[PDB]
Design goal:
- By secondary structure, the protein is mainly beta.
- It is about 5% helix and about 50% strand.
- The chain has 1 helix and 10 strands; from the N terminus they run E-H-E-E-E-E-E-E-E-E-E.
- The strands form 2 sheets. It has a 7-stranded antiparallel beta sheet, with no helix packed on it. A 3-stranded antiparallel beta sheet has the order 1-3-2.
- The structure holds the ligand COc1ccccc1CCN1C[C@@H](C(N)=O)CCC1=O and zinc ion.
- Zinc ion (ZN) binds next to loops.
- This is Protease 2A.
- It comes from Coxsackievirus A16 (strain G-10).
- It catalyses: Selective cleavage of Tyr-|-Gly bond in the picornavirus polyprotein.
């Protein structure tokens, strides 16, 4: 589990969105595994606006933050899970790192701010849904 709290937005994995998230929906995209809802309180996270390919992510299944090198956001085939059939997920970045399904939501960050959240993984891989292109997260 986990979310990004930037401005009056809450960014979560779409497959982990709550009823409250759907009832306060701002934007969702199944192909990216992302959903954004509105919040009453202001958040403290800031979004990275950069082209970093190194950063640090939080792994809840180890209670640890790990440094990683990750690929550029791309269209990758993701195996069937409890929440989606086997399909292509867009804006996904892969790295070598430990992950288990419940690690979804953990933040990946770089020196500039939040880069994305854990969304896929398996067998010593971890995949992150990028948010750096969602410029509207920084305003209104
Ligand atoms: C960190 O994720 C791991 C790690 C190990 C093994 C599997 C996963 C996640 C598998 N999966 C894919 C998600 C997606 N973005 O399509 C949907 C929900 C889900 O359970
Ligand atoms: Zn950066």
């Amino acid at each position: 589990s986990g979310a990004i709290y930037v401005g009056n937005y809450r960014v979560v994995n779409r497959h982990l969105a709550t009823h409250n998230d759907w009832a306060n929906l701002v934007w969702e995209d199944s192909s990216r595994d992302l959903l954004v809802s509105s919040t009453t309180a202001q958040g403290c996270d800031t979004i990275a606006r950069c082209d970093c390919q190194t950063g640090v992510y939080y792994c809840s299944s180890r209670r640890k933050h790990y440094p990683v090198s990750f690929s550029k956001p791309s269209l990758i085939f993701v195996e069937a899970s409890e929440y989606y059939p086997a399909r292509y997920q867009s804006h996904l970045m892969l790295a070598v790192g430990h992950s288990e399904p419940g690690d979804c939501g953990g933040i990946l960050r770089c020196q500039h701010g939040v880069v994305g959240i854990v969304s896929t993984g398996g067998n010593g891989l971890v995949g992150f849904a990028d948010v750096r292109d969602l410029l509207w997260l920084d305003e209104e």
